[PDB]
Design a protein around this nucleic acid. Structure first.
Length: 40
RNA sequence: GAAAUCGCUGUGAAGAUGCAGUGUACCCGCGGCUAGACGGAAAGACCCCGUGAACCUUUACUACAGCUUGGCACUGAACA
C-alpha cells in the first residue's frame, strides 16, 4: 500500500515522502494515528 | 370347483372315494373317536435361486465428516 508520510518515521522516510508499506502497517497504525495517509 | 363323497389289490405326475379288476354295501339321523381326506390355518421361516433388500463387520472399493499438516489471507513494527 502506497502511503504519504504526514511525519518523519524511523525507517520509512520523512514528511511528505511516498513509500510502499504493508497494508497492516498502514491500516492498523500509520493511518489511524495520523502518521501517514493513503497515497490516492 | 362340483359331488350320487365304500374296502382291497393293482394302475397312475410314481402313497386313489372318483382309474381297472374285484369285494362289500337298504335310505336317513343322534352320541362318541380322530386313521385318511397328502384335513384347516399362514403364496416354507429350512434349502436354492434373483446380476433381489436390509442391517452389521473389516487391514474390500470409493467417498465424506471429524481430526490434523503446511501455504495464502485476516497479519503489523523494530532490531539480532
Amino acid at each position: 500500500m502506497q502511503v504519504i508520510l504526514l511525519d518523519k518515521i524511523g525507517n520509512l522516510g520523512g514528511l511528505g515522502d511516498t513509500v510502499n508499506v504493508k497494508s497492516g502497517y498502514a491500516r492498523n497504525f500509520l493511518i489511524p494515528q495520523g502518521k501517514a495517509v493513503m497515497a490516492t
